Every structure is written in C-alpha cells, then in structure tokens.
C-alpha cells in the first residue's frame, strides 16, 4: 500500500490541475476585474436589516387594516338591513332574484323554480382571479342537501340582496380585494364577485360537499376556543349500527376543531379510560386529531353502562390545569343511545357552579329511554341532539357552535374583533389565503328589547380573503442575496410566510388505500385541513432557532447573529454559513415578521446607467440574433411591470422583454426602473466578459460548457450547443448551485442526477462553479457566480494517467461532500455516476460516517407526494437525509473489517475544493455486504405524536374570549 506522502503528491497534483482548469476557464478574476474596472455605472447601497423589517411590517399592518375596514362596513350594513326585515311567507307572487352558483350556464335551461328567479351573468375574464368573474352582482352557494325555495332560505335571499351594494363599494374603494363572503347560519354563502362554483351539483359525475358552517373561518368567527372532552359510551347496548354511527359522528366533530381548541376522547363501560396514548387534553392539530380518529375507529361495545364513572373521569380531566389548555370553553360531548340514570350527585359534586356545558347525543334507532340524557343536556346549560342515520351526522355535529356563541352575542360590541385564520387553500382555487372574520348579530327590536329569544344566536360570519401572494408583494427580495428571505410566524408557531411553504396540503402518517373497496362513481371527499407548517418544520431545527421563535412569538423585537446549518434548495447538501435574524412584531395583529440576512449581503449593487446609448447597447447585447457571439442568454421571469408577464417559457419571455424594451422608451412610466437597469447592467457586464475573454479560446480540451450567472436574472452559456443542455431555472434566485457557491468560499462541484431522463451524465459533464467576490470600498459583494462543465472523459484520462483502469486490486474514487460519486476507477461505477456512495459501497460509506469524516442529520418533509400502499398520489411525510463534512482534518487512515477481513483505506480531502479522494481495497477481496445506505426521500410516519404532547412546543393562545354570561337563557335542549 502506498505511503501517505505519495497519496499527498497525487491529490496535490489532481487538485492543482482541477483548480487551475476551473480558474482559467471560468474566468473569475476577469469578471472581478471588470466589476471593479468601472465602479461608475452603479453604486453600492446598504441593506439596513432593521429598517426593512419595520417597513414591511408597516405595509402588512396597513394591508390588514384595509381588509378589516371592509369587514365592519359589511357587518354593520348586514345588521341594519336584517333589523328591517318583514319575514313574508308568500314568495310566489314576489319572486326573489339571485344568481345561484353551481347551476347550468345554458340560457335554455328554463329552471322556473317557484318563488325564485335566476340570473345569467356575463363572466368576463379577470386578473387576481384565475377564473371568470362578474362584478355586477354576488353569487349564492346553497348546500346540495339544503332545499332552496324554503321559507327560511327565501327569506335569507330576500334581505341578503342588500349586501351587493356594500360589496361593490368595498371593491371600488380597494380594487385589490379578493373574495368577500357572508356565511349565513342557515347554510347560505353569498360572495362577491359572482363566479361559477368549482363543483356543480350533478352536471358532472362529481358532486360537492361544502357547508359554510364547517369552514375554518366560520368556526373561528362563530365562537371562542374550546376545551372539549368527547365522552363515548362503549357498553354492550351500543353494539351494532349505533356504534358505527358514533364513530363517524366523533370523527366529524373532531373535524370541527382548530389549533386553538384542546380535545381529548374518553370511553366508559362500567369503567372510564382514554382511547389513545394522550391521557390529557392536546392541541388538536392535524397529527393529534389523526391519532384520535385512528384510536376512535377501533372501539368495541362490551359491558354495562356507568354514567357516574364516565362523568367523573371527564370532569377530572377537565380540571387538570397542569398542561396547555384553551382555558375558555370547558364542554363535554356525551355520545350514547339511552339510559335510566342521570347521575345527579355527580353533577352536584363536580358542576354545581355550572362552569362546564354538557352536550348529549342520542345516536341510532333504539327503544331506550332518552329522558335522562335530555335532562343532562338542558340541566348543565347544554343542548340535546339526535343522530338517527349517516345523513344527520354532518348537520348535528356542527350545531353546538350556536350554543357556544350566546355569551359572545351578549357581550355586544366588545366581541366584534377581526380575527385571521391559519393558511389554507381557497375553495375557489385561488391558492394559499388567510381570511378575516367578523360575526354578525341578530338585532330585532333592539331599541325596545321585545323578544330577545332568537337574538342570542348570530346571523352569520363576515369574511374577506387575503392571498399569500399579496403579502409577498410587500416583502420584496430582489435587493437581497438569494440566501436572504422574509418569514412571518403565528403566535402558535405556524408560518404565514416562508420559502419552504408550499400550496400542497400537510401530510400526516403514511397513505394507505384499499383499491378493492372503491367504487368508480362515488366522488370521495378530498380534503378540508389547513396548511399549518411550524417554523421549526420549515427549516433545520436548531437550539438558537427555538429561542428566536419563542422570543418572537410573544411580541418582542430583537436581533441575533450565529452559525447554523443551511440546507440546499435541492435536498442533497448541507452548508455552514453565518446568518442574521432581525424580527419585529406587527402592531395591528398577532403576527411577527423576521428577515434572515447572511453576511456579504448587507450591501447590494444599484445600477446608475443614465446614458441612452449605453442602455441601448446593453439591451441589444441580450438579443437572440447574436447568441453565437454573446452566448445563449436566459432571463429571469421577474415582474418588471404588469405590461409583460412571466410565461415559464424563456425564449418567448426574452422575445417579449426585448420587444417591450425596444418599442417604448426605458423611461418606464409604470415599470420598475431598478430591475430593468440592473438587468441591463449585468447583461452588459456578462457580454463584455464573454467577448473579451471567453471568445479568445473558442475550444478548450477539458471544458464542455462555460456559464455565468449574476443577479438581476442574466444567465449566459457560451456555446449555443451547450445552451440546450442547460436544465437550470432561469430565475437565478432558485438556482441551488448559485446559493451553494455563495455560501462556500471555494470551488463547488455539483453532482449530476441519477436515473433521470435526458443527457445529464456524459453529454453535459460535471459542473464546478465559484462565486465572484469584489471589493468596491472595503465592502464585500458577491454579485455573480461563474463556472464550467468539465468533460467526464477528459477527467478520466486525467485520473488514470495502483490506481489503474479496471484495477482488480485497488479502488480509487472521488466524492464531494454529501457522499456522491464524481470519479471512479473501474468503468463500472463511472456509468452509475452521481450516485450516493452508500448505494454502491455501503460498508465503506458506513465506516466513513463512523470515523467522523462524513456527518449527517435527518429532517421531515411534511408536504410530499407519496404512493399509497396496501393495508394516484397522496400527501404524506418523507424523511430526508443530507451528508456533509464536519472535521477540519484533511487526511484519514484506517482499516475496516467485515467477517474476518481487513481492507486498508486512506481518504484525502482536496484543498480549496469540496471534493474528497478515497483509495480503498477492492470490494471483491472481501465479499461482505450488510445493507445499503440510502440517501433519498423515504416515506415515513414519524415523529411519534403522543410523545411530543408530554413536552410540546411553546405556544401563546388568544387572551380574550367570551363564555358564561349571566343573561344567557339556556332553556333549550
């Protein structure tokens, strides 16, 4: 075996050759020089991380205040208009005219429904709505199983017709308004502007299941947070249909809870116990609700009923106060069929002061007495419900919010506070939105206080949608480094804004399907859960990050600079880089906004081109006609102005950009001057680099392609034949290699993909890039990243010319940080290039991890596409692994043994490069193999949910809520 000094000589020669090739081909020094050569076409401006966050927070607060102003207007008008309603019973003579959604648009339909008249809108195409909308009136959605034309429904449509004027007034006051909707307590939903429903009743083979009373915004605005304890009877008498109905009802009621409510499910049959591994109230998020549903759909009916023990258990768990709780609405849901005992002494002992509401549900068809459960219901200020079949479950498991809203009504104007929901997907296909809610009260005979019977219930909930794209417009990012970004947090841990937040629903568990019990014509429900992703689940969790999140949850402003692990955009690498977190609260709301700015990003280049001829030349540099001279050019699809829009097709986008910039002058009456000026300046700089330096050497032996990527969105690949081999995003802020080169202070080798269609191994070559660093006035700037694509064959001749081609004695490979293969020795591993080294030599890779030359750590991706197993695509959790270098030492030596073997290895790290050289005994010498070390997204079900409930994350629930009013009548069950 060769000595250490000989291997040092080999690796020194190899690294010197590679570094010299990259430096003299990419041309880092030339670009740095021409960036420092001018220093007069641009200026260096600071990035004040304090003022920027304050400005963005003020903009967000102003937007949300504007949205909230349109809520009080609608609520007051609705209250005033309904207060002046007559409640007529004869609608045949006086038809009610409205546009019903999810109806056929063919004018020859001749509906002619008694008591109502339909409307045929025009439905022009609009922006900010990826649909066809009409601004002339408002559309009405009625649930399919709720018959329109009833006295209740027709009366609602009669007095809700006055909301269209306020809808139009709000839209004209702020033309950026999205859907604004009135969710009626009778099931109706009137929204503006009018738009056809996504799912018709029965026009296609699919149907819709949409009740406005079950929407998260309606539930949030209809009552206060709850401390719910579902009590389930599992005695022998509930065996049969009623047990299945009880399970379905419990799941449906669990679906009505949010992250501000706390729930636990208990069962009793002569003895009371929990149904899962929780043992106390839990936050009732997606994971906890999934666990509770899985536990509930496993109960069996056996034994003798005992209401005293069950109610004692429920009250004791409601009296805990040791754990996190909503601490607002202590309510008990009792699911049973019938009985003969009312447990008066238990209620007298535990609920004498009547601080706990008891809702009782009689489920199924049976001959058992229902009197005692009605007494329990309307004795402890509750309500009594009956669920005889599946069709009544949805309606009867959502009505309890009417009783819970009585103290909120009796509070008066103190309860009319605008609340904002979690991030969820809009039902009308608008993306990720948040909704501001405002309850509407029934005030009939308010000046005289005549009835006050039904007035204890709300009329409905106001609603206004705000798209997350609107908030992103208030936090511009193109003046920052591609590693910098904004993000906002709830007082619950969930992110309102994050680069890792995606429109996909949050996955829970592992998806399992039973294709043998699926009819082809059923239209199974899709989803209704919100997109609640925690801050610690959107980034790599760190001890300092937990402290920052806790500090900024409870309305504090601060700043922190520290070292953290940063994951690459493609989940394959982890880097170490400095970051600065600057956060401030938003005064109007409970949100908190933070800005993450790394070093070398406190300054940016602002273009200062003020000569028409120079701008014209820079604009004509990026023309398709001279792609043979200036190289293949890409442009980032940024929003330069509304006249031209991104198209996800770079050729036509570049053509439109050129034609727009040449047709009208760059004076930009309504275009962003800074973005265009930066684009022109960087295009001119790249063209100068290409012409003055790259064009001198048309063909280079070891170089297959040469590219330059800068800020502003200019990408050039010098050979046009290599332009079609470029598979990167034209938007430079989404280039993973760009950010990786920005973080690292050396040359970065990007491993090609594997098992991917298209030329990505041999016809393209390995990509190495370096970040361009300039010094203007002692300020560090990294405006551009350049690199080359080296030929694989040229590298093979470099490497082989011990370590010999197809050697049966010695194995010699080259890896980058992350464990991916870039060079081999046997022409067998070379074909499978870009693979994780653990998938082609698991023993050596595992030993390398053990000796601490390679570090790794895992994380969970909660928004992933998964193939459903057996117990098209569904959403679940995938566990990701990324490997990286940890130790600063350059050389390692040792022997690994596997079944009375001994293989001598000596790994060496190449200086000024993220590469490593490994020289090991041939695997054929010792045919040992335990199991592959897979580095890929693996479907996972973790983390364990009822272990995190014992030590949950820090939380800060709402402080103001309404319950237990003295004026409540509570004479109903």
């Amino acid at each position: 075996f060769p000595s250490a000094v000989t291997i040092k000589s080999w690796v020194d020669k190899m690294q010197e050759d590679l570094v010299t090739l990259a430096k003299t081909a990419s041309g880092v020094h030339q670009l740095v020089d021409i960036y420092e050569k001018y220093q007069d076409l641009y200026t260096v401006e600071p990035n004040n991380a304090r003022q920027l966050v304050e400005i963005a927070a003020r903009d967000i607060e102003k937007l949300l205040s504007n949205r909230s102003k349109a809520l009080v207007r609608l609520a007051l008008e609705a209250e005033k208009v309904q207060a002046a309603h007559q409640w007529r019973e004869d609608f045949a003579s006086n038809e009610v005219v409205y546009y019903n959604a999810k109806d056929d648009l063919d004018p020859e339909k001749n509906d002619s429904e008694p008591g109502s008249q339909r409307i045929k809108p025009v439905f022009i195409d609009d922006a900010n709505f990826r649909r066809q909308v009409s601004y002339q009136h408002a559309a009405v959605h009625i649930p399919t199983d709720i018959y329109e034309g009833s006295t209740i429904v027709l009366n609602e449509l009669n007095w809700t017709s006055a909301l269209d004027d306020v809808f139009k007034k709000n839209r004209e006051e702020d033309p950026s308004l999205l859907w604004q909707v009135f969710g009626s307590a009778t099931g109706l939903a009137r929204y503006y502007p009018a738009s056809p429903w996504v799912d018709n009743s029965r026009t296609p083979n699919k149907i819709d299941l949409y009740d406005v009373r079950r929407r998260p915004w309606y539930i949030q605005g209809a009552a206060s947070p709850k401390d719910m304890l579902i009590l389930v009877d599992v005695s022998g008498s509930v065996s049969g249909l009623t047990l299945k109905l009880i399970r379905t009802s419990v799941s449906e009621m669990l679906e009505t809870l949010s992250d501000d409510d706390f729930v636990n499910v208990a069962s009793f049959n002569s003895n009371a116990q929990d149904v899962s591994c929780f043992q106390h109230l839990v936050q009732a998020n997606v994971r906890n609700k999934k666990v509770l549903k899985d536990a509930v759909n496993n109960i069996t009916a056996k034994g003798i009923t005992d209401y005293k023990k069950g109610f004692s258990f429920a009250f004791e768990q409601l009296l805990n106060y040791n754990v996190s709780r909503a601490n607002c609405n202590k309510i008990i849901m009792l699911f049973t069929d019938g009985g003969e005992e009312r447990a008066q002494e238990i209620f007298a002992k535990y609920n004498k002061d009547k601080k706990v509401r008891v809702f009782t549900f009689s489920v199924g068809q049976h001959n058992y007495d229902r009197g005692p459960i009605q007494w329990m219901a309307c004795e402890n200020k509750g309500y009594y419900y009956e669920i005889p079949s599946i069709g009544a479950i949805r309606i009867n498991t959502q009505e309890y919010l009417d009783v819970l809203g009585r103290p909120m009504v009796l509070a008066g104007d103190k309860a009319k506070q605008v609340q904002w929901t979690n991030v969820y997907l809009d039902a009308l296909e608008l993306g990720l939105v948040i909704t501001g809610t405002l309850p509407v009260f029934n005030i009939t005979g308010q000046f005289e206080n005549k009835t006050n019977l039904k007035n204890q219930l709300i009329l409905g909930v106001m609603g206004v949608d705000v798209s997350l794209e609107d908030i992103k417009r208030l936090t511009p990012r193109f003046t920052l480094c591609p590693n910098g970004y904004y993000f906002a947090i709830d007082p619950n841990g969930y992110v309102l804004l994050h680069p890792n937040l995606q429109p996909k629903p949050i996955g829970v568990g592992i998806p399992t399907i039973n294709l043998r019990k699926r009819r082809p014509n059923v239209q199974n429900p899709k989803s209704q859960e919100p997109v609640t992703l925690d801050f610690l689940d959107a980034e790599l969790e760190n001890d300092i990050k937990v402290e920052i999140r806790n500090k900024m949850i409870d309305g504090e402003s601060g700043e922190k600079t520290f070292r953290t692990l940063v994951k690459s955009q493609d989940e394959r690498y982890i880097d170490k880089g400095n970051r600065t977190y600057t956060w401030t609260p938003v005064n109007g709301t409970d949100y908190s906004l933070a800005l993450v700015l790394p070093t070398y990003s406190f300054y940016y280049i602002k273009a200062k081109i003020e000569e028409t001829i120079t701008q014209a030349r820079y604009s004509e540099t990026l023309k398709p006609d001279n792609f043979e001279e200036s190289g293949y050019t890409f442009l980032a699809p940024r929003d330069y102005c509304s006249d031209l829009k991104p198209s996800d097709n770079n050729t036509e986008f570049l053509l439109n950009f050129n034609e727009f910039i040449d047709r009208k002058t760059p004076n930009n009456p309504s275009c962003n001057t800074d973005l265009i000026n930066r684009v022109l300046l960087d295009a001119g700089f790249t063209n100068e680099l290409v012409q003055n330096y790259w064009s001198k050497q048309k063909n280079i032996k070891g170089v297959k392609a040469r590219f330059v990527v800068t800020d502003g969105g200019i990408t050039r690949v010098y050979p046009k034949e290599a332009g079609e081999n470029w598979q990167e995003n034209p938007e430079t802020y989404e280039d993973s290699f760009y950010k990786r080169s920005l973080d690292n202070d050396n040359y970065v080798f990007t491993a090609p993909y594997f098992n991917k269609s298209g030329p990505g191994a041999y016809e393209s070559g390995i990509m190495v890039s370096k970040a361009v660093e300039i010094y203007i006035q002692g300020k560090l700037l990294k405006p551009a990243v350049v690199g080359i694509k080296i030929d694989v064959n040229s590298w093979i001749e470099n490497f082989t010319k011990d370590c010999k081609r197809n050697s049966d004695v010695m194995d010699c490979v080259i890896l980058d940080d992350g464990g991916f293969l870039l060079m081999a020795n046997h022409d067998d591993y070379t074909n499978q290039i870009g693979r994780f080294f653990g998938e082609i030599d698991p023993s050596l890779m595992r030993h390398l991890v053990n000796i601490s030359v390679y570090a790794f750590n895992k994380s969970y991706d909660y928004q992933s596409v998964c193939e459903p197993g057996a117990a098209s695509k569904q959403s679940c959790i995938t566990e990701q692994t990324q490997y990286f270098f940890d130790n600063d030492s350059k050389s390692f030596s040792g022997v690994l043994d596997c079944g009375n073997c001994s293989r001598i290895f000596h790994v060496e790290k190449l200086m000024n490069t993220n590469l490593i050289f490994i020289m090991v005994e041939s695997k054929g010498t010792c045919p040992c193999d335990t199991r592959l070390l897979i580095q890929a997204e693996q479907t996972s079900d973790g983390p364990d949910p009822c272990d995190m409930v014992k030590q949950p994350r820090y939380r800060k629930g709402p402080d103001v809520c309404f319950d237990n009013n003295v004026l409540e009548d509570y004479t109903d069950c």
Binding site: G240, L241, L243, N367
Partner: protein
C-alpha cells in the same frame, strides 16, 4: 327472546323489524313465522 334477543347487532344500516328484542316483537315474529310469510328471512337473520 332467549336465543335471538339482543343478537341482531349488525353493523350495516339494513333494518330488520322482525326481531326478538322484547316480548311484543318476539310475539309478532313468532306469529309471522306461524303464518309462513317471509319466515325464511327471519331464519336468515337468526343464522347470521
């Protein structure tokens, strides 16, 4: 009532009026079997 009383706890939503849950219903079922009308359905329910 001793044999089939309380044993018709089927999870499906199908309704079986001719059962032996109490004395009047058991009497009605026995009379129906006595008349011979649809007694095989009662026998199938008892078997299942």
């Amino acid at each position: 009532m001793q044999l089939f009383g309380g044993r018709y706890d089927f999870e499906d939503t199908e309704v079986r009026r001719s059962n032996f849950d109490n004395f009047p219903q058991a009497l009605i079922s026995v009379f129906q079997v006595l008349t011979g009308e649809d007694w095989n359905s009662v026998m199938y329910n008892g078997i299942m």
